[PDB]
Amino acid sequence: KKYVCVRQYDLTDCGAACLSSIAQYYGLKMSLAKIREMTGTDTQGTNAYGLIHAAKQLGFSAKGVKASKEDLLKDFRLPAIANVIVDNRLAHFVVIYSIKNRIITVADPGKGIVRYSMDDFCSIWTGGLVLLEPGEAFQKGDYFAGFLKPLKKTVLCIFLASLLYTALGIAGSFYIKFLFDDLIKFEKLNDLHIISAGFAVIFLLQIFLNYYRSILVTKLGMSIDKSIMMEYYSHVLKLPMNFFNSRKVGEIISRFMDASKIRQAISGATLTIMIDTIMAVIGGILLYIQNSSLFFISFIIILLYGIIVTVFNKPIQNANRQIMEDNAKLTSALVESVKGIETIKSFGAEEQTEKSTRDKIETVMKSSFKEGMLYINLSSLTGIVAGLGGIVILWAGAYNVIKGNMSGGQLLAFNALLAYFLTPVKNLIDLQPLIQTAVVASNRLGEILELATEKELREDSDDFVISLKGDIEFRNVDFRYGLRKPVLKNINLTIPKGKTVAIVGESGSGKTTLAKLLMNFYSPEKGDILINGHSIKNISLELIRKKIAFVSQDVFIFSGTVKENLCLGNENVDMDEIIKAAKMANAHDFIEKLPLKYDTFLNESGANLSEGQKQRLAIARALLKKPDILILDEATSNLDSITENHIKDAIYGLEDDVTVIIIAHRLSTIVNCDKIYLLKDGEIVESGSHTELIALKGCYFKMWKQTE
Amino acid sequence: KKYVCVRQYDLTDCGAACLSSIAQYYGLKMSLAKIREMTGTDTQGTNAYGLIHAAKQLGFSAKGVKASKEDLLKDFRLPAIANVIVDNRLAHFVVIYSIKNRIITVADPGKGIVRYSMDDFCSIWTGGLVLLEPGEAFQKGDYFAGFLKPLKKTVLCIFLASLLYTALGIAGSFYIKFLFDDLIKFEKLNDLHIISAGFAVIFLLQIFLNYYRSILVTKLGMSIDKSIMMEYYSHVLKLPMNFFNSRKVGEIISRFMDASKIRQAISGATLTIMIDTIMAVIGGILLYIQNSSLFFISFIIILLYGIIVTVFNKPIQNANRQIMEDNAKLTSALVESVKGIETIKSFGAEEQTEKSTRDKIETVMKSSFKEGMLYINLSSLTGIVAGLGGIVILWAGAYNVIKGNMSGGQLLAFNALLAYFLTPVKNLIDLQPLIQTAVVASNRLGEILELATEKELREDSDDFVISLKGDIEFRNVDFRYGLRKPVLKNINLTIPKGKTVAIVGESGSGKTTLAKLLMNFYSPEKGDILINGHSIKNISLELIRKKIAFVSQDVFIFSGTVKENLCLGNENVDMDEIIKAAKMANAHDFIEKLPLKYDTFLNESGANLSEGQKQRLAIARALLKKPDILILDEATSNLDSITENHIKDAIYGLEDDVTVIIIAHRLSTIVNCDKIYLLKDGEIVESGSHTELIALKGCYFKMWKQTE
Numbered sequence A, B: 001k002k003y004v005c006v007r008q009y010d011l012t013d014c015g016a017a018c019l020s021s022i023a024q025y026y027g028l029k030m031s032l033a034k035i036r037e038m039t040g041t042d043t044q045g046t047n048a049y050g051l052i053h054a055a056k057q058l059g060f061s062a063k064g065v066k067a068s069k070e071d072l073l074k075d076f077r078l079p080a081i082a083n084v085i086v087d088n089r090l091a092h093f094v095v096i097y098s099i100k101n102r103i104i105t106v107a108d109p110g111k112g113i114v115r116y117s118m119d120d121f122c123s124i125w126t127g128g129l130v131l132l133e134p135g136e137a138f139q140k141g142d143y144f145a146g147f148l149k150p151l152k153k154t155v156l157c158i159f160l161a162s163l164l165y166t167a168l169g170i171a172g173s174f175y176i177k178f179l180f181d182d183l184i185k186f187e188k189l190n191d192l193h194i195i196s197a198g199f200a201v202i203f204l205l206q207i208f209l210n211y212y213r214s215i216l217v218t219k220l221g222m223s224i225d226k227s228i229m230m231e232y233y234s235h236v237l238k239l240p241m242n243f244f245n246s247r248k249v250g251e252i253i254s255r256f257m258d259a260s261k262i263r264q265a266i267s268g269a270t271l272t273i274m275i276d277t278i279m280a281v282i283g284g285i286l287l288y289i290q291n292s293s294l295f296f297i298s299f300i301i302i303l304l305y306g307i308i309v310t311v312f313n314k315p316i317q318n319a320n321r322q323i324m325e326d327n328a329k330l331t332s333a334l335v336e337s338v339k340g341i342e343t344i345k346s347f348g349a350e351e352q353t354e355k356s357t358r359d360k361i362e363t364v365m366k367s368s369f370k371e372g373m374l375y376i377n378l379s380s381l382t383g384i385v386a387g388l389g390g391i392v393i394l395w396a397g398a399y400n401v402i403k404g405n406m407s408g409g410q411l412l413a414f415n416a417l418l419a420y421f422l423t424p425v426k427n428l429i430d431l432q433p434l435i436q437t438a439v440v441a442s443n444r445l446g447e448i449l450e451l452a453t454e455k456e457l458r459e460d461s462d463d464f465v466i467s468l469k470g471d472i473e474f475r476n477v478d479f480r481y482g483l484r485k486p487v488l489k490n491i492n493l494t495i496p497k498g499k500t501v502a503i504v505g506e507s508g509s510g511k512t513t514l515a516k517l518l519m520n521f522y523s524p525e526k527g528d529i530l531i532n533g534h535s536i537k538n539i540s541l542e543l544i545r546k547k548i549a550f551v552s553q554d555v556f557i558f559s560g561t562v563k564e565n566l567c568l569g570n571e572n573v574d575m576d577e578i579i580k581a582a583k584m585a586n587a588h589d590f591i592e593k594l595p596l597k598y599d600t601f602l603n604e605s606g607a608n609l610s611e612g613q614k615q616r617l618a619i620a621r622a623l624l625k626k627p628d629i630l631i632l633d634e635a636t637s638n639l640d641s642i643t644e645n646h647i648k649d650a651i652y653g654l655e656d657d658v659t660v661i662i663i664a665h666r667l668s669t670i671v672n673c674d675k676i677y678l679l680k681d682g683e684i685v686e687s688g689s690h691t692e693l694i695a696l697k698g699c700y701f702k703m704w705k706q707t708e
């Protein structure tokens, strides 16, 4: 056996890095990004419970107990993961491989191979330990193309064009060398004119080849950009709301906009690499035929250039990864700053926002200064190396001329061959900047492959039939958001079928998350939500959100025409149906006074529309969808009595086919209804009808008396 | 005089273009951007009333009457602007300059100048005319540096470095030519080694000079980008919310990010232009000394290159302006699509939101393909011209060698001089892409140069006297948003001083714009808003927003820590005051249960906070500001019973120093208050106290009876 460890790449989430390191220690050479993302890493630091769950799903026999002071154990099972409080800063996760008698081997990825004595061990940490051992499910073993395959003919044509251009250049160089070698002391004017005409024809042929080469390179880049953009965006929509809550808007906006670099750079780099490969293949044979000493000198120069580029390849990513993830932060701050235009001016804090944006610009630009300084230094070093190589080549040519080995035509041919070889040097210089494509590909694939499980695989629906009607119910449902005490602690609730039930409660008493669970926005940990003797986990997710709607309080009016916003979702809608819906939800008398009936272009999100009017419009839009089960969180008319219509028409229009769940902020708005459900401290405290709850004389009656 | 006209650049709003054209016809060389902006151009088209208002404010004596069929008028005052219904498509605006007997000269911006008689003149249009004449308020006359001035030493150093590099190159070329001319067949090994060492030393000096020059340009571009970005953001801050309502968020975000190139290309192009100027200055003298025929050939080649680059110089902007304006629209739609992630998934319409994005990508990429095809074509013709010039130069050199005019060393010197001259050709090729910076500079001066700057221009207060606070009142206030009937028609309202007054109404009855006017968000057209015998137009705008707050219903929680959000605006706040405020607005018992007291990092806008809880937090934040005049819009805790506290503590805590305006959606929540103000159809319909209004038995009583 030998010592092996994996170092740190991220900054805040070192626990996932430690888990990956122990994974490859047991022999799982899997990408750390995907494993880290399905571990469930937190920005502020996931606790040991998430790590235990990640070990369980990986196939480990993990168990978490406070760290034993006696770290000289014998029946112990290595390696181990433990917590440390580094000089009273935070809790960091470290791994220990093999104790012998006295040496504590800690493989901290932060700063390399670490070696503390027990004096430091007793000083740093306080308590924490997870005993991870494989459960034989965690099994050992030494465990893009489609886009290239759709343009095989174009790739072949581009390669043929590059080969033709290289052949034309080689033929022209050979003809020029032969003319110089033979027709030197010729003194012929017509021959010179004919040679000039031939050279002009060769140049015209080269231009003709360059036409097709450049046009097809641009066309290939176009299609590659289209494919990658479309795939990313399609995958970026199909995510659960948890990823949206976790990340900012700008950290998503900036990732998509970075394709402009990769498309152009890859389009250029493919042609450059093909041309360089062809040129090197020709040049190697040409040099081998020509001479050995000149070939040796050229090989030495190429080896020096390759040594330089290999030595300085690593540092480029170290700057690019900072540039990208600081530009992302700049965009994320600026988007939010612009969006809250009303609030920023309302409290008159413009200069503070300006100074914050100045700080963001200053850091994003100080990073760029270094990222350009490295490029300039490398370019200058490469140019100096090229100049030294050219001086050496000139000296060698002079020595050969003095010795009489090579002739003037041979010197010209050697110069042409050296230029052809240095074309690969220019290709290597360009590929030095291909790290700019590598970093953007790795950054954006970081949520393409890792989050792929969240797209549809995590659903695991597998459902035989469709739709629902009846009654909803809960069974031992425990739901938590993470880093917080559970809000849905223990619910035993069965809503009566086809009745107007309502849920009242207090602020922070989970009045919404209860409805959020029904839409399968977040999956519950324990228990299940049953509908007509079924389960949410065993029903198609499309019908789950298609048959039941949800009128969120923060209504989001989508940009475009009114007809599109009303028709969003269920497409192919006749105008008569939406007219009936608007009359049903009081959205027809409103639309009459607008300048263009159902043809007004709404800018941004209801900018030219009143907030109460937008709330009414959202209810109308939901009533278009014809939901069987409806959920209204207050936000009904928001105009005092008028709200009588926008519900009474529904209940009268229901004809007992639908059921309604009213998350009612304002008590006494729900009096003549089937049941009232209070949940406090997670548990369903008291339930019953209005008269029954009033006669009960509990906390419900106390709150009612306090209200009035 | 002579005929002059202006061509159309936009598509939908040609009236602003016609107004600008008639402005230059009367001697106004102002950018059409600002004029088009304060004309009030709509996506569909502004009527004649807005154009008349624009003429009045610009200083043109305009009057709008239906067009006279008898268009042979003699007492008339040309030029004229008239509307036309072009073959029953839309209402376009045209200008007529001079009529002789049977001549109509339509200088249509869309299709240039056309000549028509009355044969078609009566056929096309139906009715409309505006008679614009200079009222002598308009006047005739032929109506960046700081950033360059702060880097004079750096610019001088860069110029000196470029001159040193040019001198080193010239000295090396001259030494090489002299060595070839003198030591052609000397065959001295020591002399060759010494010459190689000297050439290597010269190359090292040139490499050092290029290194220093490159780092100079990099740091100069750094500072230029910093200054320009910082300037733009501040100017994008104090702009009327009108600008925010009119424009999308992406059309603002894409402008700021556009600097990424302008900075880099300008930094490169400054050094390139300086080097090219120095090289051309040297080369002209060198060629004049050398020979005339070679100088004539070089001048002809340079003229051909200039002609070919100038012929296609204008078309590049015609593509870049499309590229930028389409990328802006892509970002504007995609940002909204991402930020409405809840609503998109609520109705499960991810399919449509992908197809629309695919269409946007397709158009923004076809435009890019065209704009790259133009670049490739121009580059290919430039390369072909360069190759032809090189062939001609080789033929001329061969002819001179045959005639015996120039020698081999002279041929090498001529080749070096030709390379130095063609360096300016490469500089011109690079400056061909400087249109990419010119277009973004123009697009962004379309905002920087052309903006309202609400602080500087719209205010015009210049208040030296201390602000006075008391009862508020309205005087003949008429306020409209544009293209709509006025919402604030005619108000004669005087709020009692230091009393709890409330304003109730119906949806679409200006239930907020009335308060929006007080904050001087939009300036009223007629009348004024008086405070303690003063006016809003004659009070400092900072105090107007510092002394009175506004709790918007769409609360915007600003990203960061809770302490920052509470302390936003009024900085330097002691913790005791915010604790008192939170206890005053019920925001302390909330903050206790959170994991970190006043130190929780909020993602996005209240993502990990309850909606209602964020609403309460906004009220607490407003109560920090200690406003003398307060405006609530329901949205007080929204928990019914608890709301009693979050107002009663304020009124008890006010001690009559403050006054409160309650825009109350829910009637019967305001019973024990000073006055109730109903505004209907713009006018104040009925006012009075609760008992007085009940005894009045009007529409107020009818609505009360209908409510319950």
Ligand SMILES: Nc1ncnc2c1ncn2[C@@H]1O[C@H](COP(=O)(O)OP(=O)(O)OP(=O)(O)O)[C@@H](O)[C@H]1O
Residues within 6 Å of the ligand: A245, A481, A484, A487, A505, A506, A507, A508, A509, A510, A511, A512, A513, A514, A665, B607, B608, B609, B610, B611, B612, B613
């Ligand atoms: N991502 C999250 N989503 C929802 N609630 C969260 C989240 N993170 C933390 N929480 C907390 O969990 C609780 C759930 O609040 P919930 O959204 O259910 O309230 P609500 O229905 O808006 O309350 P109210 O009675 O004021 O109307 C709150 O205390 C909230 O601050």
Ligand SMILES: Nc1ncnc2c1ncn2[C@@H]1O[C@H](COP(=O)(O)OP(=O)(O)OP(=O)(O)O)[C@@H](O)[C@H]1O
Residues within 6 Å of the ligand: A607, A608, A609, A610, A611, A612, A613, B245, B481, B484, B487, B506, B507, B508, B509, B510, B511, B512, B513, B514
């Ligand atoms: N920029 C704008 N600001 C406000 N209203 C606008 C604007 N543009 C158009 N409108 C329209 O003008 C009318 C004025 O509405 P206003 O904003 O005064 O109502 P509100 O007080 O917000 O409404 P409510 O009390 O019913 O919720 C509405 O029909 C609104 O849609």
